[model samples]
Target chain A: EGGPALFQSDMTFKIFIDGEVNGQKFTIVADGSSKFPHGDFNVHAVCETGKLPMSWKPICHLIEPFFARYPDGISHFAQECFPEGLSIDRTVRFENDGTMTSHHTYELDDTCVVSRITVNCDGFQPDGPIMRDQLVDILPNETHMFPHGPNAVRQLAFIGFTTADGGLMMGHFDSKMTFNGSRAIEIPGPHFVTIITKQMRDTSDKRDHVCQREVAYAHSVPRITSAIG
Target chain B: EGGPALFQSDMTFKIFIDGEVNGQKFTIVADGSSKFPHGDFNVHAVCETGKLPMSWKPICHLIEPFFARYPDGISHFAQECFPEGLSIDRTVRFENDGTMTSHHTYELDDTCVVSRITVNCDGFQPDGPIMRDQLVDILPNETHMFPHGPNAVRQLAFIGFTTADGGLMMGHFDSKMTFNGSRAIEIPGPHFVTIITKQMRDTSDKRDHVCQREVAYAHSVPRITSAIG
Candidate 1:
């Protein structure tokens, strides 16, 4: 007798964040993937500031209310766990001489399903030629929440900087989360740093330091007395 | 006319943890590497239960001290920020029948280094008549303290587990120093839990629902700092 066949399917979705905000047209790209029946998925997105021709360096800051949409039509939102609010404030700064500084902040909310991001540029400007673009497959409404049964989810975020002439930049990255049925342990604080400096005319030097900061807090709970099959 | 030449060198060293305590022979392997002039070096090591047959079935309970050696003949000690002390009295436990439980008072003296570990086992021990021996990397000593410079170092210890042959096995891993500067933060208490049978092997498994916990603390005024070029 012939045996039943085993099947496997992999699906990928892309989302584009292209729109005009405050008279500036910007573009962001996000990609997501899933394997059926497993229901586990991952999404990643990035914004390009180097694409802009502004002489003033551009810095982006992160904010709360990161969103996630589930296949069941439910949506979950994430806010900064830090009392002062997760910010990219210290990331970018300006030297009195007009040299610019920028910072970025990425955060996972209390539910651990959505990662919110904010990038802030202190002295940069959007001068000349606005470029229009599109991002595909923003996670749909249904794919954002926990599945009906006993399941869990997680999220992470990072920030970076690049020069107007694409020369030197610096940035930091960090992550936090809450596990289902488990008490959430607050992560100490942010922990990664990236520094990029210019050397020759067309070449630059880059160094990355991972602080190994306390980024995750987890708690273990007893299995519920009531059993569900 | 002549141009300047750039000189660089990278070297790796190995450290061994071999000693007998109460008639038990223990051997641990650690590695260290350095790139001259810049004065930076790293060392790491780990051991497995299956490798130490006489230890215990769920060998996740053993605790070890962490040590660092400098190129200039200096030795400094640090403990796992989590699980402050050694002894089953203050450790997380899992009953043979798979019941999980814990007590939280493990604290190490300021002069000690601590490490926690776990392993995975599929009921069937490898067919060799003797357990398949394997070694795990527990912790790596990367940075050293300078007498008058940044004087603190920190690290995180994590464990993963699996069940086999009606018992449990585990894998241990850790990250190097998290919070380090002239100031020290009070280390937090360790987290603990027992792994019950239901959580280990069940048809409706919630993807390895093992206990996960951490400890954090701060130490100040290191008596000695490793020397570097």
Candidate 2:
């Protein structure tokens, strides 16, 4: 079965924030956690080649329509109207004991902003399953981008788990994509995808054991620049 | 046929900058028009009840759902979550030359927070045809509860107007609502019912117009409090 390595990456990227209020500047950022509830959540950007599969066109096409249906056009607009040179980077962090945090950053040129986000499960639960195991138990491993389109960029991330009985299970897709760009161009995919398999029964026992995986993928492309002699 | 009012009041409601960032206190008062865009907007309970058809029952019903949706389910989590009483004795003032200033106080309750909001002309355009000429012309007559839920409250206000050709119009709706409970509640039936009419304009003036007849409706139940013996 597929593992976290198929979806998570440790690459670094820049970020940006837009809009002004009353002469005050506001930058957008996603802590990968839902700490700021009042602001926008949806994040999007053009992808760089080598960051995701060149054939990832179908998934990007499928997601664009979903964004268009967002009630507030802001999120949809961001995804659809992403400017050139913009990319997004995001990651999920897990504590050694079993806590988790998701951090996302947007890079526009040299500027970056941590935009919309969500955080879950603050404390470790030994009785609970490991993050990777939990994901594999719940998600499909063979899923791929459904349809392809012009100017589309799509990417998918998944986690795999090993059960207490030493069996491997696949988790759901923590999927995100840019319609016309690569997911790694602006927003790098998750760092480590963790799935909680069980609730800690006691503080001492290392809860149900499972699999842990590191997933990373990138599509490479030639770089070109115009020069004046 | 509806036109902008000649002497209608114009006002700005805001949260005190100092109070919003650091203190638990929230202050709302109408200031001169010159102060526009300088501060955060705040909804005062008194202003909502007096200008819009807001009451304790309606306010409570409007804000209760927010608390219910709170992840942890703790209603009294923060000062921002509680509504404060508003000071509403201030009067909105209009200038003779068609300029306007507002002076109104809102009762801050223990259910909401202070945030900046802006009124814009483009927002006046509705998804469909204008429902009430009087209500439609009001630039910012509507109020929205942030993090809207069962524990949130909202109040809307508008100034009536008379057009040059004897048609009626309204300038805007100033609104405020807060979150006060732990459980979310759906807004009751009869959310807003407005009356409208279509009329033709005389070509000579080059002012093509549609006549609008307007009215709004909402429902509420009374609340009872116990007394100490």
Candidate 3:
């Protein structure tokens, strides 16, 4: 009575979400259909179809670190989020009044569930190869509520990156999330609906389609703090 | 007889630079003055006071990994970057185009000398906490020379901050280069000028001044790659 058996309900769920900030992309569709086959559900997540620079979250403890490593809450299932995985730290403050400091980590593959995010927040800092994979097959009737917010549930979890006098660095951020009525998202959410764009990454590799310049344009070189985690 | 004997020769060398893009801010000053106390030198690094988005490089082998770990280079030096300290990796491109990838490490603190950098080019992706710590006091004569051009050479050495699949992120970027004359470079530069600017970093736990959002911006979450040694 605590997870796996297709989350032990009547089954009928759908959650589809995609986002980006500078490279620009958007999406969100939360679903539910089933009335008390056992867990009777009603979930609603929307982007309508468009409109996002920011706005789309419910994060529902984002799966509470995978049921917080199942404490007496197991019913024959194995995705393994942390034999040595799962570490999240997020802090996003926005509506128009932006505030960001995010760092997350999580691992689980062979079928999907990998994560790595590091953002200090500014125009939605996301650079090169931000990944997204898809694998679906899940249906549910929701009846277990979780709407927690750690200072608005600050971030995800896993491992490290800190350098700017706070010394510590070494790259990581492999992302994912797939729930199949039996393949993934089988049901559990960090609660979805967020859209961040792209268009950032350059300390002086020079620019291309963005503009164009040479020499006498590289101002006064001496400022960098590649602090990522 | 090998570097830092005050480099040997006349005496006149200077390299002062400062820059930032997107947020604007500039500076650059390269020098070489001599009549031959020995190997009459000739330096020319410019940017008197404006224009910089790109250009100004010859990189001089970006210090060949700090003289390949100073065969005889550390006198009163300390901030070891990682062997157990000191790390380096860099790639920059541009004749009229652009490409950049860099990583470096170092440490030494009493007064200063810290380094850390992890930049993935493409408009020079550096969004926040672009760090800069300064110091000066190193002199010598000329005979040695370095004016490489990984396509006009670019970037500086000695600095840190990595973790997004790059491993062991930390900090360092000690600055110096005061040779009254000697270390090679009879003259023939890659010239140097470039500026990047912005005031980014608000990780005290999170951010603010943007708006006031209450969670609703985390969709299909799962994306990260941190491993770039």
Candidate 4:
């Protein structure tokens, strides 16, 4: 018999990005993990099927900030889409030639949270620095906590740079993360109705951007907690 | 011969209620069908496994207005929880000694709409008529259209009457309706997590009443549609 036992559990997410990058079909399977209380999410992804416009590291770096935008972290983002939770559908048009449409819903399965993002660039005609710098314009540092949490945030972004030969490379990232006790490494898969729509490209730029704010921000501030308690 | 073969599809629902009434456990499987545009939902249910305190006829009648509360009818109600739709959880305490808690969600499966209801009574202490009379208090006649739709409405109600023997009878109805092309007669089945929760009894009355209104009513009026077009 043991006097005391230590129990350890962690939060982790596995993202499966399967879509077309500049008309070339590809698949990238990525996974990340973080411990409880306050642990930074560390991600690792592999291009299982196809190639990418840029290295997977830059893409992986973009994802860390995506979840880090929330103060309570990933678990809080997952809680928002519970049974009586919220769903987000938004389109963000960048100041220049890029347009990003993202539809996020936690309604499909109890454990699964889905984000389908399609980014179309009229050829990355941006004068800004490449890498994380391009994404900075789309996702900025904001302190306010989304009233409903991260799953309910309708933030979509797209960034593309013109190739040396002057060809446009559009990207589509369809991700589904199942919140299990351990790291759910395998792609939980897509729902029947979402099969076609998840991988579809956003060729048209007709829909109006729903959010008035240029960057994603919550309507309410984070709840104040006392350290003394 | 192919001068536009009349294409017609109908709206339908199949409800499978399995739980305990009083102490004995029972399963009531019911189904209803209606046509597109605007049609009345005619229901037929059978007490599959257990005995009931009352006849199933009154219960069938109860299901009709439960849907008729909507002006655009059931199809419009089904559309509300599609993808970026809504989910409802509400409890309604009667003026007397009875309480009804309802959890409604259209999020499980795209085609499935679920409603779990539990009614507890100290004893039926009502002076009203036995049939649809008791339900009148919980569900009232209102012309306003729900801002989102019927799927988004948070309405729960319970009404019980005392037996001559002075024993208390509680009722639980767990319904899952799969809107298939034809009348979806088979019970769509419950999700893994919903299995236990759906049939679980609500023994505690500690929760605060969420809705201030006695009867369920839409926040906004029905949209004005013209026939002159």
Q: Please provide, for model 4 over A46-147, each residue's C-alpha lDDT reduced to its tens digit, 9 standing for 90 to 100.
A: 555633543332242223222222232222343423333333443434343343343333332322323333323233344523222333211111121111
B176-211 in candidate 2: lDDT tens per residue?
344334444332211211111112223443322221
- Model 3 chain A weakest lDDT span, ten residues long: A210-219
Better model by lDDT: candidate 2 vs candidate 3: 3
How accurate locally is residue A225 in candidate 1, as Cα lDDT from 0 to 100?
Answer: 30
Q: lDDT (CA) for every model shown? A: 0.25, 0.23, 0.27, 0.29
Query: Candidate 2 regions off by >4 Å?
Result: A1-30, A33-76, A85-229, B1-142, B145-172, B175-211, B214-229
For model 2, report DockQ. 0.01
Return whichever of 1 and 3 wins on lDDT. Answer: 3
lDDT-wise, the better of 2 and 4 is 4
**Distance from true position, residue B7, model 4, in Å?**
14
Residue ranges of candidate 3 with Cα displaced over 4 Å: A1-81, A88-100, A105-110, A114-120, A123-229, B1-169, B174-229
TM-score of chain B of 4: 0.43
On DockQ, the candidate that comes out on top is 3
Question: Judged by DockQ cut-offs, is candidate 1 incorrect, acceptable, medium or high?
Answer: incorrect
| Candidate 4 Cα RMSD after full superposition onto the native fold (Å) | 20.8
Interface RMSD, candidate 3? 24.1
